[PDB]
Copies of this chain bind each other. A is one copy, B any other.
């Protein structure tokens, strides 16, 4: 089993949990591909057996009365229907484990605190939209954010999938400009074009919240506008650079991923949006400073009167730090939950410690866990980590179009 060192302190542990990794990643002994962003009844039965085993362990009833009954119930159902149905408690446990198992999530200290909305009876895109609005309202909670997931009906033979076409519930439009550029968020050019193609009347601002394109089984996507008062936003200002407000920058409160597939015991939920609260560097560093995103870094540095004609003045580093300050200040001023990268990484270290005792290890993707600014100033930089795939899981899936 792999030995794992923390270089700040000298700690050494062994990741015995990785030996249970069923599905395989992209690396081989010849080459590591860890930096890549994107890496049958009997086999349904083995996945279900393992998950039922996981569930009955969690309720300290492994090998008991109910446990054997449930394994036999599942085999009979797969035999008779080609599939099976989770009990509500199994669904709650499986959603939590999927978060717990997510190697690129730095916020997993929170994994046991997840509100699970059971939407597996959803019948239409219109009902789907109602469920989504309830999710957003509950999770936003007027800025005191609460972690939640809404689970729509599972994939099943004979019927198409429920899908949310948008990659998140809240996204800003990205409009290909007149002179080649993009107005708004360049990450969202494609979904913006899809919304227009499906009858949306576009705006022309940099921060126009997109409509939702919601797909019911064997149905084309349907367009749904979010009420503005449902989408809580934060205007960005800086505590001491008063000209920063004049940039007119904003971000939204709720990070809600809506394009991933939830897998529990071999069953697949292609529509299961989940939400937490932001870590400030996602907004301040990636969304606002990536050259292919809002790309504000040079404009901010020029306004700061930094010397932008030489790299060795560290003008980029100085301006990124103040942009992150602005995000934290603005969300704190607006009373909207946010965590800075120092606090987030420190609590992740506690999570690693908890998980070593509970399970003997923790799947973690170092490149995603280490924040995009001030990497070695956080404790996770100095922590070796072992990346592997456990189930239940959130998986990437192709876009439905």
Q: Which residue of chain B lies nearest to A318 when distances are taken between CB atoms in the complex?
A: B321
* Residue A223 CB within 8 A of the other chain: no
**CB neighbours of A366 from chain B (8 A):** 34-35, 367
Write out, one digit per residue, whether chain A residues 305-322 have a CB within 8 A of any chain B CB (1) or not (0).
Answer: 000000111101110110
List the 5 closest A-B pairs by CB distance, nearest first: A372-B376, A27-B27, A24-B29, A35-B366, A311-B342
Write out, one digit per residue, whether chain A residues 274-317 have a CB within 8 A of any chain B CB (1) or not (0).
Answer: 00000010000110011110000100000000000001111011
Give, as a whole number of angstroms, the nearest-CB distance from A32 to chain B. 4
Give, as a whole number of angstroms, the nearest-CB distance from A332 to chain B. 7
Q: Which residue of chain B lies nearest to A378 when distances are taken between CB atoms in the complex?
A: B316
* Residue A340 CB within 8 A of the other chain: yes
Q: How far is the CA of A386 from the CA of B35 in the complex (A)?
A: 8
Q: How far is the CA of A384 from the CA of B26 in the complex (A)?
A: 13
Judging by beta carbons under 8 Å apart, are A313 and B325 in contact? yes
Q: Which residue of chain B lies nearest to A19 when distances are taken between CB atoms in the complex?
A: B30
Q: Which residues of A contact B (CB under 8 A)?
A: 2, 4-5, 7-9, 15, 18-19, 21, 24-37, 280, 285-286, 289-292, 297, 311-314, 316-318, 320-321, 324-325, 328, 332, 340, 342-343, 346, 366-367, 370-377, 381-382, 384-388
Kindly identify which residue among B29, B32, B292, B340 contacts A314, using a CB–CB cutoff of 8 Å.
Answer: B340
**CB neighbours of A285 from chain B (8 A):** 376-377
Contacts beyond the supplied A27-B27, A34-B35, A372-B375: 17 A-B pairs with Cβ under 8 Å: A7-B37, A7-B292, A21-B30, A24-B29, A25-B30, A32-B388, A33-B386, A35-B386, A35-B387, A285-B376, A286-B376, A311-B343, A314-B328, A366-B367, A367-B367, A370-B375, A372-B377
Q: How far is the CA of A36 from the CA of B44 in the complex (A)?
A: 35
Q: How far is the CA of A353 from the CA of B4 in the complex (A)?
A: 34
Between A and B, 24 residue pairs with Cβ closer than 8 Å are A4-B36, A18-B30, A21-B30, A25-B29, A27-B27, A31-B387, A31-B388, A32-B386, A32-B387, A289-B377, A291-B382, A312-B332, A312-B340, A312-B342, A314-B325, A314-B328, A314-B374, A316-B374, A317-B324, A317-B373, A317-B374, A321-B321, A373-B374, A373-B375
Judging by beta carbons under 8 Å apart, are A31 and B2 in contact? yes
Q: Which residue of chain B lies nearest to A369 when distances are taken between CB atoms in the complex?
A: B35
Q: How far is the CA of A291 from the CA of B372 in the complex (A)?
A: 19
Judging by beta carbons under 8 Å apart, are A5 and B37 in contact? yes
Judging by beta carbons under 8 Å apart, are B36 and A32 in contact? no
Give, as a whole number of angstroms, the nearest-CB distance from A127 to chain B. 36
Q: Which residue of chain B lies nearest to A385 when distances are taken between CB atoms in the complex?
A: B35
Q: How far is the CA of A366 from the CA of B367 in the complex (A)?
A: 8
Name the residue in A25, A30, A318 with the highest tally of chain B Cβ atoms < 10 Å from its Cβ: A30
Q: How far is the CA of A314 from the CA of B371 in the complex (A)?
A: 13
**CB neighbours of A385 from chain B (8 A):** 35
Q: How far is the CA of A340 from the CA of B290 in the complex (A)?
A: 19
**CB neighbours of A32 from chain B (8 A):** 25-27, 32-34, 386-388
Judging by beta carbons under 8 Å apart, are A2 and B36 in contact? yes
Judging by beta carbons under 8 Å apart, are A314 and B320 in contact? no
**CB neighbours of A25 from chain B (8 A):** 27, 29-32
Name the residue in A21, A35, A289 with the highest tally of chain B Cβ atoms < 10 Å from its Cβ: A35
**CB neighbours of A26 from chain B (8 A):** 29, 32
Judging by beta carbons under 8 Å apart, are A377 and B320 in contact? yes
Judging by beta carbons under 8 Å apart, are B324 and A37 in contact? no
Quick one: given A8-B290, A27-B27, are A312 and B343 in contact (CB under 8 Å)? yes
Quick one: given A18-B31, A34-B27, A297-B377, are A316 and B342 in contact (CB under 8 Å)? yes
Q: How far is the CA of A337 from the CA of B102 in the complex (A)?
A: 43
Judging by beta carbons under 8 Å apart, are A328 and B342 in contact? no
**CB neighbours of A30 from chain B (8 A):** 18-19, 21, 24-25, 388
